[PDB]
Each structure stands twice: as structure tokens, then as C-alpha cells.
Amino acid sequence: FEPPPGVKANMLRTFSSIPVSRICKSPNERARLYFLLAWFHAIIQERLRYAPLGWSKKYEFGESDLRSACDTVDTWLDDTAKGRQNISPDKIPWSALKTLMAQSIYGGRVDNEFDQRLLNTFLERLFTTRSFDSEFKLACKVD
Amino acid sequence: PAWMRTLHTTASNWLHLIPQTLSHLKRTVENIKDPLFRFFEREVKMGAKLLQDVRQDLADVVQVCEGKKKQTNYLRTLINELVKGILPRSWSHYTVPAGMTVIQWVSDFSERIKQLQNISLAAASGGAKELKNIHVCLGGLFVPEAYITATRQYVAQANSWSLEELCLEVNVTTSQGATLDACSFGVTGLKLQGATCNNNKLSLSNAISTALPLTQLRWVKQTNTEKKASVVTLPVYLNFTRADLIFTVDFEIATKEDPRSFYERGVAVLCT
Amino acid sequence: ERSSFPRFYFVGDEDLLEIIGNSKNVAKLQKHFKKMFAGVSSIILNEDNSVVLGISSREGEEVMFKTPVSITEHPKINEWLTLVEKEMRVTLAKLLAESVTEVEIFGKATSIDPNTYITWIDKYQAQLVVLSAQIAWSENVETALSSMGGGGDAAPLHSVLSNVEVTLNVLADSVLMEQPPLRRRKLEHLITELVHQRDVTRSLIKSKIDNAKSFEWLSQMRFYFDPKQTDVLQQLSIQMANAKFNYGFEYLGVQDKLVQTPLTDRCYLTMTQALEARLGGSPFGPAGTGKTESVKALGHQLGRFVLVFNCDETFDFQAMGRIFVGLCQVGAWGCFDEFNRLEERMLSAVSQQVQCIQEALREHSITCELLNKQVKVSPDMAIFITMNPNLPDNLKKLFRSLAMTKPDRQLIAQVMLYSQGFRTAEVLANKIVPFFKLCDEQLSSQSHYDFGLRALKSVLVSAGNVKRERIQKIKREKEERGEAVDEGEIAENLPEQEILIQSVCETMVPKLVAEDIPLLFSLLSDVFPGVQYHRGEMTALREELKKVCQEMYLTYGDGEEVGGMWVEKVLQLYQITQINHGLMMVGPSGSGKSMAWRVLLKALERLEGVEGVAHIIDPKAISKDHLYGTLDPNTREWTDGLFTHVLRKIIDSVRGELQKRQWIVFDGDVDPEWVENLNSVLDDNKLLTLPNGERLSLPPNVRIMFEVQDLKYATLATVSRCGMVWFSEDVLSTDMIFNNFLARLRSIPLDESPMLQIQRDAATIMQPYFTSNGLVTKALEHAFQLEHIMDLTRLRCLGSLFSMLHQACRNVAQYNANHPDFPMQIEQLERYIQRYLVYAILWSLSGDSRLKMRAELGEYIRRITTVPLPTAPNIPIIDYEVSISGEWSPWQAKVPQIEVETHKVAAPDVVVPTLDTVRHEALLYTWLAEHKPLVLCGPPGSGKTMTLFSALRALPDMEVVGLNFSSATTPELLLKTFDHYCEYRRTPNGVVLAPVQLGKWLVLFCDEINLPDMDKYGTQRVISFIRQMVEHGGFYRTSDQTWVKLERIQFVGACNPPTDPGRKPLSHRFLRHVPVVYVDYPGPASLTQIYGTFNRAMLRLIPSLRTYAEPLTAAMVEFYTMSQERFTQDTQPHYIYSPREMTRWVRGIFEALRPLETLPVEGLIRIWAHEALRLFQDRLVEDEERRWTDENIDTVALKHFPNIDREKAMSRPILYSNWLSKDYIPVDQEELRDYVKARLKVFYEEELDVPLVLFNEVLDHVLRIDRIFRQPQGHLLLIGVSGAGKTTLSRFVAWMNGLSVYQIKVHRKYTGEDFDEDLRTVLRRSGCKNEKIAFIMDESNVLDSGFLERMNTLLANGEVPGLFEGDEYATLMTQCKEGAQKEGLMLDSHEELYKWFTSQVIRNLHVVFTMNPALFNRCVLNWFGDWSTEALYQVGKEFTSKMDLEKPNYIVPDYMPVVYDKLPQPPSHREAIVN
Ligand SMILES: Nc1ncnc2c1ncn2[C@@H]1O[C@H](COP(=O)(O)OP(=O)(O)OP(=O)(O)O)[C@@H](O)[C@H]1O
Ligand SMILES: Nc1ncnc2c1ncn2[C@@H]1O[C@H](COP(=O)(O)OP(=O)(O)O)[C@@H](O)[C@H]1O
């Protein structure tokens, strides 16, 4: 059995794995955050297949990292939004998540420094308040 | 059996293609003072030792194929592991790409020994002064980070400053149009992945690999000034598998170019 | 009891029984308090020992109890242990509250009074003051940000930064001046933490952080202290990022602190997140990057204790499992060391255990099963698993991972350098770190080199100490001249880069080889340009060394002068003694080591006035249990070991030895077996632990040094726990040894003076040849160019030369004594000494080489020397000798012509004088008079053993005691033989070992010195013991750990070349003592003479044929020579042809001609050919080889003996038997076939009944086998294809000869002990009952090489000492007594009964070894091979006889492929089908 080699397949697998109740909680900005983290995990995973270029060595960016990242986002968003149905995009702890996914999760297995630089680059491109604009680009010049 | 004969043919061919012998470097107190000479003599000793090892092992194999003597235990392992095509342990003392097969290993080793013959002949012709202007290739040298550190030590000793207070600058130029400055060392064979550099300026492109005619390594004292946002740091790897890091170069990208986009596309420098 | 107070789950179950046993004993629980806690070394109690007053540490810092717990009201061990723990936590918290109140009072101040600040420091422990500083800084910064809550407010964070700056300035001034070392560590930890705080506050200021909830502040470790909380345990809350933890409130004593590398707090964040995420972390990476120390620093910062389970061969399971579940109860932490080093099954088991505990922990987010026990998992746990590149698949899902690839060494060096009060700390750090990066690569790699980060830490600490001693000296000088004393003033004008150069010189220069010195100087020039250092020469010590070397006759020099390198090495040794209390003078054998430390001790004694006492202990010679001490299984009584004994004797201060300087030199090899108990000494604790429970603090004067030759087996942990000095072989110059020997010879007389005068005259004569670029050194290097049987060590050869020159002096003295009227003059003495010196060079340099290389050495010397030499056109000088009259005379004249008695031909003890054996007689005399132990080397059977026995029996006053060194030889056997022949007597000097008989030098012969196996740490304990005796002139008696000198005793050994299997080359240390001489197989002319004597005595039996003795010897020698050059050992391992087989040849001829009275020459040559076939051809494995052998024997018989009838003399069926006739007459093959067929009818009728066909090979082989049985000690080697008839023919011969056949019944259950039982059975049957037995056994019967070795020793000795012990021994003696009583011999003691038993066995037991250099040449091999065409044809004919294979219609083909050569020309039908 092989996972289908696709960004779409990985996103679908991620959203199927994550329970429906968890991703819909009081903060309605949570769903955007969950989608962004899922897209980031999928882009990393599918970069693994191109090991000489996508990284420097095949890391085990397994599903456990995704569960840990989901728990981190859940708990920190619960911290920042104390039972509020909405939270402003600027109030999101963007730096906290950026540094956490840069050092603890998805970064621990990262051994080479330049892989860490890549992870920082992806995280700073994706995780920011600018994401909550309708004109955001998850990629540039796909074709 | 026939694999006796085919292995005999392969061993004969390898002994033909591998160069005969490697000359050692003559020791001298002034040469011992120079760090480049010490690095190069260490390299020559290692290369001559391993060349003697492989030459003797191939002579052993070819004589055994003719039956004049019997497979020992280590010989049994060596013949079996030549037939199976996987690289022997006793031959690999320097870092190698994981999947490299014996045949292109021998081709690479022939290349390395030829370059070592070149540098030994150049050293014998003159001295460490002529040793300074040699255009070595990082992939060819067994320990190239030793070479870059030796260049650092050479410039520090020649011009009398601390090693910590020194930094490296890159001047990617054509081999013909290059200047041999006292701080400049010629490095060849460097290749970029996913970028093209013109006049020390980088541009993203879809070309898979761009060859540098000659990379110029110059050591300049630490300027203590913050790097411009247009300058990017490129990792340098020995092999395409990029499992080992040698050193880091700093490159200035072109206008309109996003250093984040250099990072995402995995732009890198490869020795081989 | 185990459930209550689970903290003693870490100590052993045997130690648990101990604490139960010592329940009413508080003073014996000290080991357990050490093991169970972090830094707790003892609990403080009153004189009543009824209440605990405080808790101390390994350093000595103590914590006083707020409410002491009295054991009287809580007699139960668990109850008062729990009370001690809880009250320790309570007092730690309350003392923290007091210290934090103090520090906040000090804080928020424009300036700090230094006096009050150090008073606060000393008022509390190191950990408490560190934690108080952290808490105060945390509260100050948090309040400063809470003021920032208005947004854009002017920052009082500048005030916090300035407060930290001024406190850091105060510490920078304070650490500088001399302080108590515990205060020193307190100051170092505080300055480290405050440097970290200053950097993090600078980052916060740069980032312009505004809100207290900004993640930029959340990331850093925040300390929250609320004294208002009732429970003191959680009054301190530790919080980093989202994680929040309570303080462990456990006492750590003093622990090394890290430097808060960005890598380090990266790890901090990742760990704490993982624990809040309720899973452990796995910070993998290469070793030496601080992974385990990072985990320890996390545990310490939270105040919990970490367990460092080191995972190597020392790792265990049951103790590991119990300490693991103890961790489970207690809640402390545990950091596994390198996890990939575990073996696979162990790795899986421990992985399953940790997976169980991890899932329990995640469940708690609660009991789990450990050792069938449900255990409440405490929330506070963490478990960490470092790794060296992966995780087992059962834990990849449960554990995080980190990249510990490279810690910031720059930051570490900057923090620790500044922690030592260095100004310009960052400059020196950024210089020194790349310097060690350079050292780890450019320096030639060595086993002992260690340029890891730990070496950097050590260099920094040493540099700080050097700066302090320099400022102390400056302060003393300024007090002397003037009074203006200011620490800041002297500090400012104090260079610091010179200080680091000095420190690195004093720590790393000793460890370099002679070539790395210019490399390190170049590196210093490149990293620290313009700055250089020179060690301050200690002129007092220089003069004391010069004077002592003058007294000890050693050579002295300064720098470039001869021995100057050795002098510098001695100075570095002194320096590192001043710094380090533990040493290893690592270097090749005989470099400088023993005499360097001796001369240093004596120079220090004469300079300081503190007398020096040494306890030179060899660790390997004694067993480890005896080295440290024994544990009584019943009464646990403490029998101290040697080192523990001497330590306690020094401690007791009985005779002022505390005032004396004590040097416990550990001469010998080192391995991680005994030093594991001694590693607790070489650290800063300086305390010796014992298994019984006693502890001994190391007095300051005691200095432990290790005198080890190589560190290929030393654990790097122990290598780094103490200093090092390298003594390269270049340090010891050759001419330096020459001067040593010349001075010693000129000084001391040999007996214990006229002979001193003759020594001085001899030295004057010989001096020119021992100058630099002299004859001896060129000859020595030439001998180094050649090869030698044993490992050529230069000191060995020089010692041999010096010993033989001393013997030349003794010979001159004896000649003067025999000629009192005419003492030798200067000219004659001069000639004698020159020629003796040339002779000694020849026999000492080439004495371990083949004859050809001896000739080459003689040729080289003749080319280079000027001494007159014999003018022999071909004979090499080595075959010549020098007369006592100083003339060159051939050795052949010294060889007499013995006429051995005709019944003593080829006897085991008849030595025939030959050139080689008289030369070796002279060398043995020379080398035993000097009492220099020696070893014989040469191919087995060359005659060395008896070439020595003849000398030593010819020696007037030396008993020979041969000993058979086996693979399992232990020095216990040497002790046994010593107590058997020698006795211990108490002299005023001390206990003395002396042989019982007087005036009689006991020589101990060792047949095969190299046979005992090399340990896995490359040391032969026996050879170490003899090295200890020969060097030290004594040994240590383990019964009372007393130095016992050896008197009137010397050792001699022998061994074949090490290239033979089972032969381990000896340690160069032991070689440098014993000179070795090569005894090869005798040459052609030597063989001619040696067996010409044997045959001339042989043929006296039959006078009519005496005239044919010498041509017979010539033919025998020629045939053996051919069989030499043709049958090399390369073709087959057993193609070895020694003069032992010549002795067997002549012995067989003797056994043939003895009962007989008359034969012509034809019968003689038939006998001669028979024996030649039985020796030289019966072992051949190829048929063309045996055809060649037959051709050669016939040709030699023709050429030497022309006038003899060929057909009768060598009739092809050469078969000799004694069964048909009364004597051993040549036997007709057909008639012998008839007789053996009749005996086969008898055999079939009585014994096994299977058909046996009698083809020629069966006849020849049955005759050979019976011939071997009929002799005593007949042991035979039946190599041949399976089924070919080996065992059946052997059984048939055994039944024919009346022998009882015995095969061992072998199966997979059959282990070594069943084999030993069968061995005792067969031995007692064949030696006690006088029941002859044939013992057959196969390769299928040998399931272990131990079987082979036991058989080896049984056949070499005739008996095995290892079979019969204890009850079995007593029963054997009972049976031997009964057997001797039946036989007619009255013997009482066990020794003579044992000898008679051995004689009976060697005369009655016959073992045969059947397969398909030790056993070879000592047994008889016979190659059956496979049945030839003939044998197959007869087998077919005999078996295909019942059925009618007869066809009258058969038509003979025109062509027959004639497979059977002897097929009848008309092949009948049966003949054709059999073919
Ligand atoms: N300074 C010196 N002057 C004269 N002779 C010396 C000097 N130093 C060493 N020797 C000689 O060199 C030899 C070394 O002796 P020693 O047994 O002390 O060496 P070592 O290095 O301890 O050897 P080992 O490893 O075998 O124990 C001895 O013959 C000793 O007399
Ligand atoms: N953060 C640090 N601060 C100070 N010294 C360190 C630090 N990390 C490592 N070291 C030094 O480096 C060495 C590494 O020790 P260790 O923890 O055994 O490494 P590893 O965990 O990789 O085996 C130690 O001897 C220590 O002196």
C-alpha cells in the first residue's frame, strides 16, 4: 500500500484524519490555521520525494509531527482566545507558532542548518497575519 | 567458470586505466612551515598509500584469475564483492556517495590520482609559492574542507592576522579571465543547482546545473558590517546526495529576486 | 518494604539486604546515600548518632536542618528516610526564600557592597544562590515589562540591565582575588548565569518587546516565586514557553553548569514542550556535543535528579530494571547514554520497557506493569534517550528528536573564560575555539589525542588557575617591594593571551609526539600572532635533577643537549604533578618512564626536604579482587587489597607518611576493569570507594600515576580523568643509553676493588665504539633493517650486549684469579674486549635471526668495523669464538667427539656436542652467570630445550625446574612452584623469597612461555608477573600485601616463533628484559656428525656391518635434506621435517636390530627403507608425491650403496611385522595376508562381524598402526576420507594387540564437562589399573577447541593437571595408592603417587586422532586417502561373488578402456563388470 503521491491526496488524508469536531471550535479563525498547517505539512511531505533537491536528507516528517503541530496550535489558540467566537488575525500568536514549528516540531529532525533555514523560510512565508487576506498566494508562478 | 575470465578482463582493464604510481612530496623546514604544503603532503601520502593498496589488490586478483595462487579469506571477500558490484570497504577510506558502483568509483579514483600527480609535479617543479596558484577541485580532493582551512591558514601566515578575524569572498569568473591575487585561490569544478550566476550576481532559472569555469576564493578581514539583504548564503556540498557540508559561500542575488525564493528552490553549490 | 520509601530502588538488592542488615547502623549507609541522591555524600548526625542534623556533599558543603529528624522516635528505616527527604525539601525551600529575600534586597540598587554580596554567597549553597539570582532577575524583568503595559513607555529595563552589569562587574573583580574553591565554584556559576541574563536582556532590549505576554519573552525561562503558598514544594514555579513545572527541591551539592548556548536553550524549549506534550525527547547527535550534559542541566535547573545509565558492556538488566521502576516511583529523571551501542535483544527489551512506561505517562495525561508490579507513575517524570547516528520503531512514535550536531563552542569559551575573570573574554574565545578546530584536524591523529570540547573546558579552567597564581605572585612581589596593592590595577596591566598560551602549553604539549611540536607552535602563531610564551625554568629543580642524575648515573642536559628532551619531559611531569593528582606517563616501552618519575621524586625530596615514598604496584600481575580487596560471603570482613592497603597505611599517618610525599606508581598495562573502581579517585572527589562500605579520602600528598605503554584499551573517560605526558622513543637517545651503561659499569662491582679497576679499564678500551655515529649504533640500525623472529626492541638488544660485556669482565676476572702470577696486560685485555664486543654484537643483534641474516650482519660489521676479524674465506664470524687470550679461534675445536654407549643411542637425554650446541652452551653460561633471564626461539624440535638442560645440569649450583606453560597458565602456578621449592623468610630489609637449599640458584624453566592466551585487553598476566619480578627484583605477596624480594633465583624460558598458531608475540616490555637467541634446525654437517655418532654406537651391535655406518648416515642426511627442500610447509601445514624425526628413525632402526643377531647389508637397507617409508612417505597426501619419495629413496640407496642387489634390498612389498615370527623380521605380504586373514576369522567370530578385504594398502596401514601402538606414548593421526577404514582398522589393531578400544559417545548435549568426566575415566583406567587402552576419537567428537587444547596438553605432558581436583583428586590418590600396593611399590605422599600415575599413563595410554606444528612432529600422521583403483577392484570382486556374473556368451572387445591397470588381458565377464 502506497500513499498517492499528491499534494491533494495528502491534504485530503490530513483533513480526514483530523476529527471534524476538533477543527470547528469557538475561534472561527481556527479552521484557517488548520488549513494552513495542513498545507504546510503537505508541501513538506511532498518535498521529501525530491530528496536531493527538496531537502538534504530524507527526514521522517511523519504523521506524529502533524498531530503535535495540531495540538500546539489548538492549545496556543485556546490560550490567546479565551472563549471568544472570533479573534483578530493580528492577535494570532504568529511568532509563537513560527518559532515552535521552526525549532521543536518539524525542526528537531532537521539536522543540517540549511534545512532549518528552509523551514524558517516556509514558515515565515505561510504563517503570518498577511495570510488572512483574500489575495494571499500559497505559491508564486505555479505555471 | 566464465566469471573468472570476465573478472580477469575487468581487472586487467582497471590496471590499465588506473595510473601507475604517485610520487611523494619532499619535506623541507620552510615547506613544513607552510600549511598548504602540509595539507598537500598529507593528501599525497594518503593517495599514494591507497593507490599502492588498490594496485597490489588488482595485481593479486589478476594473478589469481590465472590460478597461480589461491583465494584467501580477505581475497575471497574482495573477489566476491567485485563480482557483486558493491564497493569494497577496504578501498573506501574517503567519503563516497552511498550508491556509487565500483566502476565509476575507479574512474573517479583515476581522476583524483591524476590531479594528485599534477599537484605533486607542480610542487616538485617549484615550491609552496607555485603551490599557491594551483587550481584544485574540491570534489577531487579527499578532504576539501582541509583545503579551505589550509588556504585560511596560508593567508593568515602570509599576511599576519588571526584566523578568526578572516572571512571568505567569492569571485565567480572565467578561467581565462581570472587574476591570481595573493589572497586568491583557484577552485574548479563547482556547480550550482537551480541558479545561474553572472558577474557575481545570481538569477533563478530552470537550468538543472550550471558549471562554474573557475571559482575564486579570496580571504578578506572581517569587515564588521551587516550583510545586505541582496546577499544570500549558499551551502556547498561535495556530492549530489548533499549529505556532507564543506563550507558556506555568500552570494549577491540580482534585483527583483527574492532570497526566500532562492531558499525554497534549494539552490546549492555542488563539487561533483 | 520496597514500596515504602522507593528511593532505595536504585541501590542493589544485595545492598538492600545489606541496609536491612545494617538497619541499626547509620555509619554504614553512606554508600547508599551516595547512590540514591544527587550530590549527597553523607548525612550529618550528632555524636549520639540518634538525630540527623544536616546533609553534606562530595565537596563538603553541608545543609543544616531546620527541623532535625531523630531516628529514635522513628526507628523504621523507611519512615526516617522519608522524613529526611521531606525535611530536606522543606529546608531547601525555606533557605531559598531567605536567599531570594536577600538578593532582592541587594537587587534594584545602583551599586552592590562586595562584602555583603560574598557574605550572601557563603550564607547559601551554589544551587540556592544561582536559583535566587534567576528568580530575582525574573521578577525584575517581569515587573519592568508590566510597567511597559502602557505601551511605548520609557524602559526601566535599562535599569535591570545596568543592575546586572554592575553585579557582573562585582563578580569579575571578586573571582579574580584568591578565594576558597567552593566559593570559587559558587562565583563561577553565578557569573555564568548572569552572563546569560545580560545577553538575553540585551536581546529583549534590541527587540523592543512591549507586553509581558509577548512570545519573545515567553520563550525564555521564567522563574515565579510565591512565598505566600502554604506548601513549600510548589512555591517556586518554573515556566518556559507554554511549559510550566514545579521545582524538584532536591539537593544537588555543586554541579558543573552549562553556558546557555542557543543550541542549549533550543534543547530546553524542545524538552519542556515534549514533557508538557507528555512524551520524552531523544536529542541525538555525535558524542561529545553535550547531549547528556544538556539533559543533566535541564534536570538540575528543574531541581530533579537525572540518572545517567551508561550503555556499554557494563550495562545490565535486572539492576537496570529495578532502578528503572525506582525511577517510576520516585519521579526523578533518567538519561540513557548512547543507545545505539546496546546489543539488539537488549535494545528491544529496554525499548519495550520504556515504551510501557511512556504509554503509562501519556495515560496519566495511573499504574503500569514493571516486574509484575503496578506502580503509580508520578507526573514529574521525564526519560531521555541520546543517540549517535535510529530509534527503535516502538519508540519513534513516542519520542521527539533533536539535532545536537554542533554546540556553540565560541559562546561556551566566552562564558567560561569570562567566568574565570578574564577580560577580553570574547576575543580569546573566538580565537581559542577555531584553534581547537584546527588541532582536531591538522594534528596527526593519535589514540591518546583528545581535542573535544571537554579539552577546551579543561584548558580554560587551567588558564584561569594560571592567571590566579600569576596575580598571587605579583601580589607577593608587590608586598615585598612597596605596599600599593590593588587587584584591578594588577589585572589591567596583566596580559591574558600569554596566559592561554601558557595553559595550552602546560596541558597539550605533553601529549604531543616529537613531530607535532612544530605543528602546535605554528598553530599558536597563526591563531594568536605576535604573542609567545616560554616556561619559567625552575632552576632549583634543574639543579636538583642534575645532581640526582649524577648520583643515579643517568645523563642530563639542557634543551638541545643530550637528554635535554628527557629533562623537559621531567619538568612537564613535575608541572602536571603540581596541577594534577593523577597521571599516565604514556610512551613506548623503555622510553623514560620509571626512571623519569624516580629521578623526579628524588630531586624533589632533596630540594623541598619532603622525603618520597613509592608504592610501585603492577595491576595485572595481581587479580583485581586481590588488587582492591576481598568481600567475605558470610561476615563481610574486609581483607584489604594491595592498593587499598597502602592507601590506608598512608592515611593512618603511623610514621609521618602524611608529611612524606607518596607516589603510587601503577606500572603495567591498563584496562577498564580495575580502573573502574579507581575512577572515583582521579576526579575532584579524591576518595577511594570499597565494596564493603568503607571510604578513604585521598590525602593531598598521595599522587597516583599510571606507567602504561599504550592506550589502545583505555577508556577515554579514564584518559580524560587525569593528565598525560608522552615519552616518545626519540626522548631516549641511544648514545644516552651508552653513557648510562658505561657509567654504571665504571661505578658498581658485579658481585654486590680490583674487578672495579678492570671494569674501568675495559670501559676505557670500549668507549670509542659507543660514541655517537659509532660501530654499535650503525650495527643496531642495520639489525633494525633486517628482520628477526621476535619483535626487535632496541632496549632488549642493548641489554643483551651489556649483559654479555659484564660477563666478559667476569671472565677476565676469573682468568686473573687463575693466573695470580701473571695478570692480563693492557694490550691483551684490549684485544679480548674488542673481539668480545664484536662477538657480542653478532650474537645479540642477529641472535634472533636465521643463519643467513646472521651472516649478513657479520658481513655488514666486517665492512664497517676496524677490529681484526678471522680470515676464513667462507666461515662467518659467528661460528668463531674469542679465546680468553684474546685470539680468534673456531668453535669446532671446542666440539669433542663423544662415543655414546650402544644402549644409549638416540636417547632423550644424550646431548651430542655440535658447533651450535657448544656456542649456545657458552651463551647460556654467559646469560645465567649475569642472572639475566632469557628465552629460546626456534622451530619446534630444534633441540633448544635440551640444549639448555645440558648446560644447566652442567651448571654446578643450579637446579633445573621445568614448567609446562599452557594456554590457561596463571601466575598461581608460579606461586605454587615457588612455595614448593622456595620459602619465605623475614629479613631486616623485609620478607625474602629463598629456595630451601642454600647457595644454589634456582632456575625455573618454562617450556613454552608464549602459549598462555593474550587477554582481550592485550596482556598476558603470567608474562607480566615475570616482568614484575625481573625488573623490580621482587613481587607482592597477596596473602599479606607485602613486598617480597627475590634472592638466589632466575628464570629461563623457551618458545617457538610466534608465527606458529597459538603463539602470541610477547609484550615488548618483557622482551626488553630477556635477550632471545635463535635455535634453528641443525645444518647438514651438524646432522652428519650428530647421527654419525648415533649410528657408530648403533652398529656396534653387529660387528660385521660396522663399516657401513658412515655411508648410512650420509644417505640418511641426504634423503632428509631432499625431503626438506621438496616438502615445504606452504603446500600443506604438516609438511614439517625436523631432526626429531631423525631421532625417531635411528630409534626405530635400533628397535629393529636389537633382538636380532645377524643380518647382511641387504637386511639393513631393507630396515632402513622401511623406516624411511614409515616416516617421510606415510604422511604424504598426494600419490605423485609418494612416487617421488620412492624414487628418491631408491636413488639414494643406489648412489651411496652401489654394491648391493637392488631387487632383494628394496623389494616393493616392504612390510615388517612381529606377529608371524618372534622378532621384527621382514614379512612376506602374502603370508602376512594369510595370518591377518586368520586373525580376522577370530575377530569376526568374537568381535564385530563385517567383511574386510585385504588389499596392499590395508596391510601397510595395519602394520603402521600396530607399530605405533607397540611403542610407549604412541599417539597417531589418522587423516583420511570418511569411511575409508580408519576407525575399523584402529579397532582391529587394538583387539589384535590386546588393547581396549575407547571412543567417546558424543551428542549435542555432550558438553565439556562430560568430556572431562570421560577423560578422568580413561586416565584412571590406563594409569591406576594398569589397563592399556586405545582411545579413538574423531572430528565429530570435537565440538570445541577446548577439547583440542586439553588433548594438546595431555599428549605433550602425558597427563593434564586440570582433570583431577578436590574429591576427584583424593579418589585418584586412593586408587593410585591401591594400584601401587598391588604392583609392589610403597609410596605415601601424593606427589610420587602422581608421578607414578603419570608414568603409568604415558606407558599405557594410546590415543589416535582421526581427521579427513604441535601435534605435528609430536605425533604420527598417516594419510589413508581414498581407496585406489586396486582396492576398489578387489572390494568389488569379493563382494560381487555370490551372484552369477558369468557369461559364456561374452565377447571380449577389441578395445578395453582398462580402468583397472592390473585387469587380466582377457577380461572375463566378472572382471569386466567389476572394472
Ligand atoms: N636520563 C637517563 N640517563 C640514563 N639512562 C637512562 C635515562 N632515562 C632512562 N635511562 C635508561 O633507559 C632505560 C629505561 O628504563 P626504565 O625501565 O625506567 O624505562 P621505562 O620507560 O619505565 O620502561 P618500561 O615501559 O619498560 O617500564 C633503562 O635502561 C634506563 O637506565
Ligand atoms: N552547553 C555546554 N556548556 C559548556 N560545556 C559543554 C556544553 N556542552 C558540552 N560541553 C562540553 O562538551 C563535552 C560533552 O560531554 P557529553 O555531554 O558527554 O557530550 P555528549 O552528550 O555528546 O556525549 C563535555 O565534557 C562538556 O565539558
Ligand SMILES: Nc1ncnc2c1ncn2[C@@H]1O[C@H](COP(=O)(O)OP(=O)(O)O)[C@@H](O)[C@H]1O
Ligand atoms: N644435539 C642433539 N643431541 C641429541 N638429540 C638431538 C640433538 N639435536 C636434536 N636432537 C633431537 O631433536 C629433538 C629436540 O627437540 P626437543 O628438545 O624435544 O624440543 P622440545 O623439548 O621443545 O619439544 C630431540 O628429541 C632429540 O632427539
Ligand SMILES: Nc1ncnc2c1ncn2[C@@H]1O[C@H](COP(=O)(O)OP(=O)(O)O)[C@@H](O)[C@H]1O
Ligand atoms: N579394506 C576394507 N574391506 C572391506 N570393508 C572396508 C575396508 N575398509 C573399510 N571398510 C568398510 O568401511 C566401513 C566403515 O569404515 P570406517 O573405519 O568407519 O572409515 P572411517 O573410520 O574413515 O570413517 C566399515 O563398515 C567397513 O566394512
